[PDB]
């Protein structure tokens, strides 16, 4: 139960004809997949662990002005030229200053001078690309066996490494068989269109074009001595003091302005490897060769006693921690539910097969009770431990929460959000295709619109759709406007 | 929740307090209007070399 | 700032967001509105940095 009470888990139930279900695995939150006869198992993506980063260019945030040399030619003559202009280590500017007899020139008028300053730039930003050839992914899979001290245990699991080379893997769960992960890291995230920029000890994921469009001097990354910079005047200001002379002043450390310019970028790790977090990918879970823990186990014949107060998780799933007081150790727990003196059995059981492994280690079970008051029975006779739970809520409220969760997923993920619980359906595929077309056309229009400008554009667009007589586009404009209100109210996660 | 310190499941408060040191700083100086002083040159066209 | 000085409109100087203190040449002062130079980020929902 590595993922119980994680605040973002979302259940996937039902397989396809070939007993496979695909799923998108986001870093924040996991996927607990249950089937009719397969063990319910928690799957959470952990890290992407990129390696062999190549550095494209190095923006540099603070410079140093040295060797300020100048040359002024008399007016009514060619513009001043210095040998340091041709040098690639120097930054120069041409200006016009007033020259008379007191300045040495024979005839009055504006004269041209240049001030070439040798640009040496102290602290720099390295922008590193990751190639899909060496992108990695670590997936931890946990069939939540009824097991002591397993609820919400991040340290317990069976890791499966899925790289674009040999993406399809097979994770050998210790007792329940071998889960298969036939996945595609190619469509997980746009790492071709991203730059990892490492400033001091931190770093971030930023869009490639945004990184290339930054107002900062840049040099091609080749690990060479005394690099030649480009666009140096972005950290050098030349000030003409009343058109008599000019001086060269370096701006300073662009670290704070760079941290403010990074708002909206997702932070990353640098110490101990790249280990990009905040990613996502799509796995197709092949549960063909999974098996339950001894479906043929003899049913337990002695009563169970509680050992921890039953607590309801955020999603309404009960957690019962029981200790078995019998002598026949390997046995399958008898579990049943009631509702209002009627064995409706509307309460489901997430933990597929509650078997007591040792009879000395207390066993914990996660169950999903009905929305009404329900009595849960964990025994066979009158010694049966009876838990009654009242689950506050409504089925309509549950549907609304699920719809909101799905919309939030369709906001974080685009066209690929239709494959979260897909079983390869026909309606689902058509919906994915139409959403692909519409989302491409939409994000093409709103690429770059900010958080508040999206809301403003949406309210303007819905007002326009309310006042347009042609209903064929009035409905379309209102729909688009509401979608954009939602996206503006969801963006900046 | 469970596996994290206590039985009840939900959202728990958390606070991370951190000391602050300024390092570099900048100071705005008001100009004392009494001590403000203007110096103006009066050169006369006398034809000195 | 360091060896450079500027004339700035006083209201604009008071408006610019940066932690500030009385400027009474006291070592280790207390900076009002010091939250502008610290950012607290949640690693999803697990922790605080």
């Amino acid at each position: 139960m590595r993922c119980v009470g994680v605040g973002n888990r979302d259940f996937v139930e039902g397989l396809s004809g070939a007993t496979w279900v695909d799923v998108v695995l986001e870093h924040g939150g996991c996927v607990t997949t249950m089937a009719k006869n397969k063990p319910t198992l928690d799957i959470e993506l952990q890290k992407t662990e990129a390696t062999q980063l190549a550095t494209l260019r190095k923006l540099c945030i603070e410079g140093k002005i040295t060797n300020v040399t100048t040359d002024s030619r008399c007016p009514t003559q060619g513009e001043a030229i210095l040998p340091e202009e041709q040098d690639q280590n120097y930054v120069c500017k041409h200006t016009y200053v007033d020259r008379g007899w007191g300045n040495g020139c024979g005839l009055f008028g504006k004269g041209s001078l240049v001030t070439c300053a040798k640009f040496q730039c102290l602290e720099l930003i390295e922008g590193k690309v990751v190639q899909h050839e060496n992108l990695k992914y670590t997936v931890i899979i946990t069939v939540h066996t009824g097991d002591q001290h397993q609820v919400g245990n991040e340290t317990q699991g069976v890791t499966a490494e899925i790289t674009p080379q040999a993406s399809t893997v097979e994770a050998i769960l210790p007792e329940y068989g071998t889960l298969g992960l036939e996945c595609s890291p190619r469509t997980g995230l746009d790492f071709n269109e991203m730059i990892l920029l490492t400033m001091k000890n931190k770093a971030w994921m930023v869009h490639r074009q945004w990184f290339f469009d930054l107002p900062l001097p840049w040099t091609s990354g080749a690990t060479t001595e005394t690099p030649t910079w480009n666009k140096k005047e972005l950290l050098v200001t030349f000030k003409n003091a009343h058109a008599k002379k000019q001086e060269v002043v370096v701006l300073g450390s662009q670290e704070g302005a760079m941290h403010t310019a990074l708002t909206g970028a997702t932070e990353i790790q640098t110490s101990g490897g790249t280990s990009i977090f905040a990613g996502h990918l799509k796995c197709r879970l092949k549960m063909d060769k999974l098996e339950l823990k001894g479906m043929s186990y003899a049913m337990c014949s002695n009563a169970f006693v509680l050992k921890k107060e039953v607590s309801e998780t955020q999603h309404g799933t009960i957690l019962i921690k029981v200790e078995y007081k019998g002598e026949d150790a390997p046995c399958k727990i008898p579990f049943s539910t009631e509702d209002g003196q009627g064995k409706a059995h509307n309460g489901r059981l997430i933990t597929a097969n509650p078997v007591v492994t040792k009879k000395e280690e207390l066993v914990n079970i996660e169950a999903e009770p009905p929305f009404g008051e329900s009595n849960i029975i964990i025994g066979i006779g009158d010694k049966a431990l009876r838990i009654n739970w009242y689950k506050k809520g409504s089925s309509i409220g549950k549907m609304f929460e699920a719809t909101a969760r799905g919309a939030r997923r369709m906001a974080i993920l685009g066209d690929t959000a239709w494959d979260f619980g897909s079983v390869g359906g026909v309606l689902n595929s058509l919906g994915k295709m139409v959403h692909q077309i519409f989302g491409s056309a939409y994000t093409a229009l709103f690429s770059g619109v900010s958080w508040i400008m999206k809301i403003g554009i949406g309210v303007l667009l819905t007002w326009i759709g309310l006042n347009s007589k042609n209903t064929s586009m009035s409905f379309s404009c209102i729909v688009i406007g509401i979608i954009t209100l939602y996206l503006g109210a969801v963006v900046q996660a | 929740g469970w596996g994290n310190g206590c039985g009840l499941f939900g959202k728990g408060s958390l606070v991370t307090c951190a000391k602050f040191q300024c390092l570099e700083l900048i100071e705005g100086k008001v100009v004392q209007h009494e001590n403000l002083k203007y110096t103006v040159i009066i050169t006369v066209h006398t034809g000195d070399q | 700032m360091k060896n450079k000085a500027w004339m700035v409109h006083r209201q604009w100087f008071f408006d610019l967001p940066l932690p500030w203190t009385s400027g009474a040449t006291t070592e280790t002062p207390t900076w009002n509105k010091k939250e502008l130079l610290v950012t607290f980020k949640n690693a999803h929902a697990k922790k605080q940095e």
Epitope: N201 | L23 | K2
Partner: antibody, heavy 122, light 109 residues
């Protein structure tokens, strides 16, 4: 205990690169500079550049920019330094010193190295 | 601007030693001064780890201060061990580099 120990005394002829090294141990290397000071025989002390091993940025003295290069190599906690084309004039002893990151600690140096003396003669 | 200091000396009885560095308006006037002791043949030692602040030992025989564009190291009486080469170092901002003094051979006489 924190200390800096050099590579050891070296001698080379004019027009030959030399790579003076400086070992660092006992503290967090990435949190302090290496100020690589120079001192000619019986002459005034002369600072010539520091590097930030947390990032690798180098602040050479204007005189020594281009003539010298400094590398952090934070894996082994060893702040290397190289001289591109060693001349007869540049005979001295090259200390490596530890300085603080902030402005008040730019010019304060504690735990200097012994200094690798480099003699240049034909 | 380059900060300067002259070589000085004093007798073994510690009357007073006045060893002064006069820098520009960008190096000394806005940055803390740092004093260094160098016994010949040895690596320099950080005599002052800040303006008018001592890291360890030798109290009241080494005590400095800066007023405006100049800095100095005062005394309440010298000893025989106080014979070394002294350096004042400040981080210039216009030149954006660490400036070291020209040197001074203080000899116990």
């Amino acid at each position: 205990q924190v200390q800096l120990v050099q590579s050891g005394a070296e001698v080379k002829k004019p027009g030959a690169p030399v790579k003076v090294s400086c070992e660092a141990s006992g503290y967090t290397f990435t949190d302090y500079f290496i100020h690589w000071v120079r001192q000619a025989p019986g002459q005034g002390l002369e600072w010539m550049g520091w590097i930030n091993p947390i990032s690798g940025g180098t602040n050479y003295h204007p005189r020594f920019h281009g003539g010298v290069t400094m590398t952090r190599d934070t894996s082994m906690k060893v702040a290397y330094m190289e001289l591109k084309r060693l001349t007869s004039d540049d005979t001295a002893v090259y200390f490596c010193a530890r300085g603080r990151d902030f402005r008040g600690g730019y010019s304060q140096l504690d735990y200097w190295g012994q200094g690798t003396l480099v003699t240049v003669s034909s | 601007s380059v900060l300067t200091q002259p070589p000085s000396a004093s007798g073994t009885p510690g009357q007073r030693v006045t060893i002064s560095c006069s820098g520009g308006s960008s190096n000394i006037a806005i940055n803390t001064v740092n004093w260094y002791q160098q016994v010949p043949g040895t690596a320099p030692k950080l005599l002052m780890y800040s303006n008018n602040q001592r890291p360890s030992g030798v109290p009241d025989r080494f005590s400095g201060s800066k007023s405006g564009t100049s800095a100095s190291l005062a005394i309440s009486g010298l000893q025989s061990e106080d014979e070394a080469d002294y350096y004042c170092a400040t981080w210039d901002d216009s030149l954006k580099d660490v400036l070291f003094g020209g040197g001074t051979k203080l000899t116990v006489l």
